[PDB]
Amino acid sequence: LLQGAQILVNQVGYHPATPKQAVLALAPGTAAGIRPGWTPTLQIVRADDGQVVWEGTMAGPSEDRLVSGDTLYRADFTSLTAPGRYVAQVVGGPRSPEFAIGPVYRDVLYAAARSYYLQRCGVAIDDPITGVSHALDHHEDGYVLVDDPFYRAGTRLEATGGWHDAGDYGKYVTTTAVTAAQLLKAYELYPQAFADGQLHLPESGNGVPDILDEVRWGLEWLFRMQRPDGAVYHKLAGLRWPGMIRPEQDVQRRYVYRITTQDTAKAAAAWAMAARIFAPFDAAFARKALAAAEQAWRFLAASGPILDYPAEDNSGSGPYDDRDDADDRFWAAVELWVVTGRAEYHDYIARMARTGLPAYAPVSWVNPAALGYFDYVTLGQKGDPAIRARLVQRILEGARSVFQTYEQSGYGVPILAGSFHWGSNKEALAKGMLLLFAHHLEPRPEYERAALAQLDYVLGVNPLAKSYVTGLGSNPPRNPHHRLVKASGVMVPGLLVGGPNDHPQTKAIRPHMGPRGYADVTDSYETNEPAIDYNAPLVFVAAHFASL
Ligand SMILES: [Ca+2]
Ligand SMILES: [Ca+2]
Ligand SMILES: [Zn+2]
């Protein structure tokens, strides 16, 4: 009757203070013959003894009709708060992998945040913690692709550094800027989760929280991607996709692709954020970030949309073809307004408020404007009270629609069947972030539970019983679409893979499988590839639960 059902738990585990779910999922070909009134019993059991420490009848069945299709039962063993290691065991039924009760999101946060260090480009790594190593890569980054006012095609720019974007080695302003902004916000809201020396970095012990050293790596690369008029180049990559080789073997010439106004505004926003946040630690870096943001805005105020993405620029890198810059300009306006207080920036906001504010949506490289909504409401001084009230209402409504989807979803993931896209994991966690934004304005325990459920979900509470974060839990991605991992045979831990995707591009998954549309194989770049913008909301949501 309980074959082959599965009991799903967070494969890392649970903090003592939080709700603690376990989900019994029945075989797709099964009940059907649910004997009416049948009730599964769950025990939690010490890993060492097998001593039962918690026992409870499971609620259910429920049919996850809008998402997985599964028949679920569930328990909440919140009561159990004794630190240690455990297994969940359905009587006469399946057993879970081992998990801890303890401050588990400190280690999750660590791995996710430190993964950026392991993605850095343009610098040798020989890391003893991890075993990850490669010699100096991409020290020739890079040559200007098209003529512009400053440089002829073929000019060498010093645009070394930054992060490898994903499982390739391209560096892209569009993800780098939203990623840096989101790490910054994690730190700003949860500074007590982030210390100097936390991340075992080259910068550990300089008196600055390591997460800010990492952010600074990304932002300093943005500086090199900025043209003296303030415009920001779109991305830097080879003409060809490297094979599964090390980054130091990827010796093709690399090119700096043409500017874009969305990139210019995203970098403005992230820099203006850093100006505010780095002020107590490094006042000179603060100023510099502020000067850059200001020069970028000068460019934007003199320029219409520039959003050209020639198909041929995609020959060795992804497009990130964000085809509207208004949500990016809004965000840049807010952040500049917040740190300078200047009318010129608030004027832009008020003008937009007359014709229509950017749509409120989970933070993404297309639309980052939720950060502007939030930062205006929480950080803006002497604003317009009618705008502020509009921003607040949109923030609470956004969480509300997220929460409604979460309630429709047996596994917690706020995404319905038919809507699983490339990066669905990131989208889950980013929706977790909108719940937490609303929670921050208006505390609401169910929202915090729903956000936690996004961590549980990416860490094994899902119909594949899969941990989508490398090196975490008991069933992580062993074959990530990641060139260094594949070439080196050394795992890079702490990277979140995209996850389930209804719309396949490769051979190893079929369409419309929803939360089941995933394959742990190297080739599946649409399902099993990590990216910097995936890790960003992971670090955010994890930091919430690492600090309380
Ligand atoms: Ca430091
Ligand atoms: Ca945009
Ligand atoms: Zn590199």
Side-chain angles (χ1 to χ4, degrees), residues 196 203-206 208 210 213:
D196 189 14
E203 307 90 345
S204 287
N206 66 357
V208 181
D210 281 4
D213 294 313

Side-chain angles (χ1 to χ4, degrees), residues 280-538:
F281 305 105
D282 196 322
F285 178 78
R287 283 177 208 109
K288 180 189 204 194
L290 169 62
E294 289 173 328
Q295 180 55 50
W297 186 265
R298 263 164 237 136
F299 185 85
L300 295 158
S303 171
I306 301 174
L307 298 167
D308 301 316
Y309 304 100
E312 69 269 6
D313 288 3
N314 308 144
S315 68
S317 65
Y320 290 117
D321 51 333
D322 169 9
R323 307 197 101 114
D324 182 0
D325 73 9
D327 51 23
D328 315 279
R329 298 176 186 242
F330 169 82
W331 173 42
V334 170
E335 306 301 353
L336 276 159
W337 179 56
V338 165
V339 66
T340 73
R342 260 185 248 118
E344 67 181 316
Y345 309 114
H346 190 94
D347 286 349
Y348 183 89
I349 303 165
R351 187 183 341 142
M352 211 187 267
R354 256 171 258 123
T355 42
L357 294 166
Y360 192 77
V363 166
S364 76
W365 63 259
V366 174
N367 182 349
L371 296 173
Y373 273 81
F374 192 75
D375 278 356
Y376 188 116
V377 171
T378 62
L379 265 18
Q381 321 217 140
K382 290 230 291 187
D384 180 318
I387 293 167
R388 167 143 25 222
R390 284 161 67 191
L391 300 180
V392 164
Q393 162 245 172
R394 307 225 135 85
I395 291 173
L396 304 170
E397 178 56 24
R400 223 181 298 124
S401 59
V402 171
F403 193 72
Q404 156 177 170
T405 309
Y406 155 82
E407 292 204 299
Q408 293 163 153
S409 180
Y411 289 97
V413 57
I415 304 168
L416 304 177
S419 283
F420 286 78
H421 309 118
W422 198 334
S424 75
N425 287 351
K426 177 272 296 213
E427 177 178 333
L429 281 162
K431 287 173 166 183
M433 188 194 295
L434 309 174
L435 296 161
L436 293 174
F437 282 167
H439 180 66
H440 187 276
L441 294 189
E442 207 178 79
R444 178 173 256 282
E446 72 191 358
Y447 279 177
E448 201 173 286
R449 180 181 78 248
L452 176 58
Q454 304 320 311
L455 296 166
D456 297 331
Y457 167 84
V458 298
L459 289 171
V461 185
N462 62 58
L464 299 175
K466 191 77 188 157
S467 162
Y468 290 109
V469 183
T470 58
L472 300 185
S474 64
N475 186 18
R478 278 155 201 106
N479 305 309
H481 192 271
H482 194 101
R483 271 161 183 91
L484 177 63
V485 164
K486 185 56 179 191
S488 76
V490 185
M491 190 48 66
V492 176
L495 304 164
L496 173 63
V497 298
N501 180 350
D502 278 314
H503 305 101
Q505 302 233 163
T506 68
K507 194 145 139 294
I509 53 108
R510 61 165 175 143
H512 306 122
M513 299 299 280
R516 277 183 176 86
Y518 160 91
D520 185 7
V521 61
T522 307
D523 331 85
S524 183
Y525 62 77
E526 84 282 40
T527 263
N528 203 41
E529 188 188 19
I532 56 170
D533 66 314
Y534 300 176
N535 262 57
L538 175 57

Side-chain angles (χ1 to χ4, degrees), residues 145 236-242 250 252-255 257 312-317:
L145 183 64
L236 198 158
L239 300 173
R240 294 171 304 276
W241 293 100
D250 181 44
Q252 65 173 314
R253 172 161 284 206
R254 306 232 291 184
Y255 292 95
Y257 289 72
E312 69 269 6
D313 288 3
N314 308 144
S315 68
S317 65

